[model samples]
Target: KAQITSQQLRKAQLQVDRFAMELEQSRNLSNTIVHIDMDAFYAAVEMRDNPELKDKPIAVGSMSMLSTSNYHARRFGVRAAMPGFIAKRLCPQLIIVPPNFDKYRAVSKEVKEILADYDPNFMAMSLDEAYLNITKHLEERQNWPEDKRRYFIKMVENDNPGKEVNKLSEHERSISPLLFNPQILQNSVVFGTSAQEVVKEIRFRIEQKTTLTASAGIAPNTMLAKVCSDKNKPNGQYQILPNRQAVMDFIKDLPIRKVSGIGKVTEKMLKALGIITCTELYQQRALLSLLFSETSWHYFLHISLGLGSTHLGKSMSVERTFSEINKAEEQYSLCQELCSELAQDLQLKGRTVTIKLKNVNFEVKTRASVSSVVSTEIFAIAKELLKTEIDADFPHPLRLRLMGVRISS
Candidate 1:
């Protein structure tokens, strides 16, 4: 949609990079989310302190359905979705084994610890992935509301002492007493709520803990930032240039297959629709708009506009969910095809949305966020949620048990 030159992209990136560093240093009041998916997670670590595993077909996770495999196994027609027995049938030599979660868990903790070293309060995504909500961690202490400023100043003088004290180590221990570094906040400055100091602290923590380098993706929003972080996967970060054109250019390299809801099956369908890249998806807006119901239409439009506030938080953080309906892509698509008039205008972000289901006899219901931010429409939120939770939380769908949506700015 928007064309950008390398020169412009670089310049804009430099400017936005500052914004991101500042934002990450002092979070804005806006609800921010940071998704951190470990790189080639399973295989990468195996190759990491153990060079022998390099290029080998490695798998992570229990022998259960949750196995994660490498490219070599894929070439042998082996996959995680397949049962261990079937996978072996395809590749008799397939290296299949249960993951030492204790080991993986240790490493994961190291990574999480690394993030906390920079900023705690990050919402954990799986063990490897997480949404770092640095809203408060990055706030410019002096700029805070008056009462907040006083509290921040007071807390800094005391070093927010109670929170993560137990988690600090020798390196942190050395600097733990240095929060009152004289050079930092002179006569007027109180707590050095400065971002540069925060970044330096984070870097030191990473070096102390994991010893593994990491790149970050910093952005105003989670989506663009998530993509940017992965751009230089091993140990680099890409911050989205705030310019709207940068948003358009940044995702051009991304394919429809990459979008969350546009999964394997959906990718094929979208491909059949003559859509290839995200750009194509953006172009097909009109037809997709016509194909969706009113509520779903809003969802799709927001997606096309690249304004995603998808559930970025954990289930515990949210309280209410609206219109929980469960079904797969096409199947659910057909069902909601006719409900075109019920769409409502959902303008704000951070309204809690959850998915729960009641099955025959089974009373407990389970729900999770597709995205953590907010819903563009209940239509898009409902059906998929129903499908995602139906079998997990409840075994059978009894007479409608619990239903509703919660909204808060």
Candidate 2:
């Protein structure tokens, strides 16, 4: 229990600074992070089996700690994580149900099983929201024709032995599409003609298996995906296209506060800096970097660039090693190959490219290029950057021990 010396502080600061500058990798731009959030999980569950409160304002949980409220309750200011007494004061007609933890846990397991079918590594934050890396699943499914996808889903559901497994549930099969059925639209929206048919089927299966309405967001990363899920609200889904321009455009005008991980304190601090929007955050980078820690600066930079992790509780990274070769020609070829690998790893095209080089003297040089749009042409960019390095560093033949290529998030 003692204070660190000035030298120790400097050493840590330098390490943080260099780490902040390190290239980030492992995101596949083609990756799809689907965030499934059961609209008002606890309250919705109660309403699901007990339709008595179909149009009523209802809350689920005790006066000490209300778990969730339905849309009707929310219209009267009832909300999740609020105390039941306060919610009651907001909506006198609010219906309060006692806690049913065991039932909710059972439902959560049912939903998680469905999620695991797609991503064995998918994560569930709670009983309500889940994050899934459906990249591999989507790649396999996205190419199949819609009719085939539907047929495949039907086939899977029917594969069980000794039962009418193919038969639709009494609730779903009974509803006619011709009649004005909002659930028909909303239910299928998460699974049908709304976004990609594969995702529709995923949601369709969720509801097929669980009899609950869950909203979803599909995007390159988890943060954007989560935000988009909220856009469709209860029983629907939204897809954010997986491209840098597309991501940037969607977040450009969005309020910074709405971005995940920004709490009241951070919002207030940013507001004081006059950064209310993502675009504004981009413009104030210099001030932000100076004011925030290296890690914080890196995060703001991610938001400003429309860069985000498609999965929660995970970081994307890529690295490579090769036998020593001092030849510049071979180095350039390796760099292109490495960048190609990096880009594919995250299904992404990157904005920045950094080259890490080790010379014969065991000295290391790290160089980063200006922002470049996503493309296969990244190889050409890598070539040119290496070319710049040669004329500047290789007055004598540049002897190198190692080289690496890294891309932006």
Best by TM-score: 2
TM-score of each: 0.46, 0.59
Candidate 1 segments exceeding 4 Å error: 1-33, 45-55, 61-66, 69-94, 139-204, 211-215, 293-297, 310-409
Top-lDDT structure, candidate number? 2
Model 2 residue 242 CA deviation (Å) reads: 1.9
The per-prediction tally of clashing pairs is: 27, 11
**How accurate locally, in lDDT, is each candidate?**
0.50, 0.69
Candidate 1 C-alpha lDDT tens digits along 1-409: 8555546656644554453355344432244345566654665556566766666665555445536666566777666667777776777766555566677678888778557523446766666666665555666443533222111111124222343654476667677667871222211112244433333334334433554445456555666556656766665555554455655566664665556654576566666778777766655555554444555434444445455542242212212222323334433453244223234433323434554433221133445454556334544655656555444446543233233333322
lDDT of 2 by residue, 89-192 (tens): 99988999887988899998988867865677898989988888888776655554332233112211222233343346676565655459111111112233
For every candidate structure, what is the RMSD over all alpha carbons to the true structure, in angstroms?
A: 20.7, 22.7
